Design a protein around this ligand. Structure first.
Ligand SMILES: *[C@@H]1O[C@H](CO)[C@@H](O)[C@H](O)[C@H]1NC(C)=O
Ligand SMILES: *[C@@H]1O[C@H](CO)[C@@H](O)[C@H](O)[C@H]1NC(C)=O
Ligand SMILES: *[C@@H]1O[C@H](CO)[C@@H](O)[C@H](O)[C@H]1NC(C)=O
Ligand SMILES: *[C@@H]1O[C@H](CO)[C@@H](O)[C@H](O)[C@H]1NC(C)=O
Lengths: 100, 100, 189, 50, 23
């Protein structure tokens, strides 16, 4: 019988997967020994205690993550998004549009 | 003026960062053991700091029961844990359905 | 003699960074303004669920175990050179790594913090040891001795992520109102 | 409304990607349905109050 | 700079997301 816990503590065992290099300022889907997510990675100046790895905010969201291998702190921000509105006159008058 | 759809930026790259270690996990010492223990005195072994590989276990084809609760066996080589508990014992064939 | 705990014995509940946020959590804590037994110049004491230890060179270390003999027991003895940690029958495990506070609790978790020259004030405690050994402990032997209880707490983080204040949610009706409002200041009403 | 985003609603976890990367589509649908129902009810209540 | 009365100034001086926006 094998029993797991899948806690958020610093991981110890992992799959036989490989590792790539860090890329910044580009929308990427990071996977740091788990913890899947998409966003833009920059350099975070937030002070971390030696035992502190994960960052969190008023509504969590895990804004800060520490590198597992190189042991560097990072900041996480979601990619830009928004709605689209179309500005048009009546189709009787014309058929040109402008988007917002 | 009307609202039509939403705008969202797509990701471009993939980032994977796992702690690089090479300690192959000691599963043989438990599966191949000469003498197991009585069910009333089962034996527990902790596991840590190892690179597990459950694919080889799942493809041994010598097992008559492989039931995983709360995680699918195929997706087991993609996620990391904090510690793994392995315990073993020997019981009759009728009672095998009571371990659930 | 006895002494009141004032506001002492608050550690970091987890290893997750937070900043400028009022977070409420539940864990084993030393109740505020509680009585702590005083010892000086040394018998065994029960463990229960977690023990608070504080003292003010001469102190050697701490030992744990149900019989403290014939069954497995803990053994944590400090040294001038490094520190000695081993577990076996008296091995089964070995490890080497003013005011001194410790929040030993039970795997085995240990927190520590040292402050210059019990005083009135607040100071948090940081974790140091997370050894994964599982065994029952009932008796403790080795100052002052505290105990832990399951009381929820309200924690305050400053801009740098360091705990500066806390509220005992089950102490007084004023504290209950503070915890309900999630604020450190309450307006008339 | 924002705080209501961190409730299990009976599912194994409150993280969609977590429960998607752990279970196969044969049995992730029940958890997804539970989360969907909870969040939909929360949105309905918020809209009525507004 | 904003061309408002002293009383209006006094009144005016006395008073990261997922799908939420303000128009
Ligand atoms: C990962 O590799 C880097 C460079 O090879 C090394 O510094 C680091 O210690 C490795 N991580 C682990 C967990 O061994
Ligand atoms: C146990 O022994 C078999 C015999 O070949 C081997 O294939 C296997 O890798 C060993 N370990 C486990 C965990 O089965
Ligand atoms: C430790 O001793 C107590 C007292 O007899 C007992 O209740 C408890 O079950 C023991 N621990 C374990 C793991 O058996
Ligand atoms: C936080 O750290 C900064 C240094 O980065 C320091 O100037 C400041 O005083 C600290 N905050 C407090 C409340 O001490």
């Amino acid at each position: 019988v094998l029993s797991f816990e899948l806690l958020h503590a610093p991981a110890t065992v992992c799959g036989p997967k490989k590792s790539t290099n860090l890329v910044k300022n580009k929308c990427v889907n990071f996977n740091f020994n788990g913890l899947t997510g998409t966003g833009v990675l920059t350099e975070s100046n937030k002070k971390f205690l030696p035992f502190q790895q994960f960052g969190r905010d008023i509504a969590d969201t895990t804004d800060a993550v520490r590198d597992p291998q190189t042991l560097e702190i990072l900041d996480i921000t979601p990619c830009s998004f928004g709605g689209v509105s179309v500005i048009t006159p009546g189709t009787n008058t014309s058929n040109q549009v402008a988007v917002l | 003026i009307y609202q039509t759809s939403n705008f969202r930026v797509q990701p471009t790259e993939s980032i994977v960062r796992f702690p690089n270690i090479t300690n192959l996990c000691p599963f043989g010492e438990v599966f191949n053991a000469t003498r197991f223990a009585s069910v009333y005195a089962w034996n527990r072994k902790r596991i840590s700091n190892c690179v597990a590989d459950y694919s080889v276990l799942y493809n041994s084809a010598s097992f008559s029961t492989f039931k995983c609760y709360g995680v699918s066996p195929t997706k087991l080589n993609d996620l990391c844990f904090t510690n793994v508990y392995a315990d073993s014992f020997v019981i009759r064939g009728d009672e095998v359905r009571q371990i659930a | 003699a006895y002494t009141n705990s004032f506001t002492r014995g608050v550690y970091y509940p987890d290893k997750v960074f937070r900043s400028s946020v009022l977070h409420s959590t539940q864990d084993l804590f030393l109740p505020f303004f509680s009585n702590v037994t005083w010892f000086h110049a040394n018998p065994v004491l029960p463990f229960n669920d977690g023990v608070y230890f504080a003292s003010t060179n001469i102190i050697r270390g701490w030992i744990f175990g149900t019989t403290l003999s014939k069954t497995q027991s803990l053994l944590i003895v400090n040294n001038a050179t490094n520190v000695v940690i081993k577990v076996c029958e008296f091995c089964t495990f070995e490890y080497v790594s003013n005011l001194r506070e410790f929040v030993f609790k039970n795997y085995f978790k240990i927190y520590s913090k040292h402050t210059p020259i019990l005083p009135q004030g607040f100071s948090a405690l940081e974790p140091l040891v997370d050894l994964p050994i599982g065994i029952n402990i009932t008796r403790f032997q080795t100052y002052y001795v505290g105990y832990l209880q399951p009381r929820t707490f309200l924690l305050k983080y400053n801009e740098n992520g360091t705990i500066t204040d806390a509220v005992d949610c089950a102490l007084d009706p004023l504290s209950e109102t503070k915890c309900t409002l999630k604020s450190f200041t309450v307006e008339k009403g | 409304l924002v705080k209501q985003l961190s409730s299990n609603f009976g599912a194994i976890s409150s993280v969609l990607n977590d429960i998607l990367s752990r279970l196969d589509p044969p049995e992730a649908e029940v958890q997804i349905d539970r989360l969907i129902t909870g969040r939909l009810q929360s949105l309905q209540t918020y809209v009525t109050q507004q | 700079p904003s061309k408002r009365s002293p009383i209006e100034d006094l009144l005016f001086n006395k008073v990261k997301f997922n799908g939420l926006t303000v128009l």
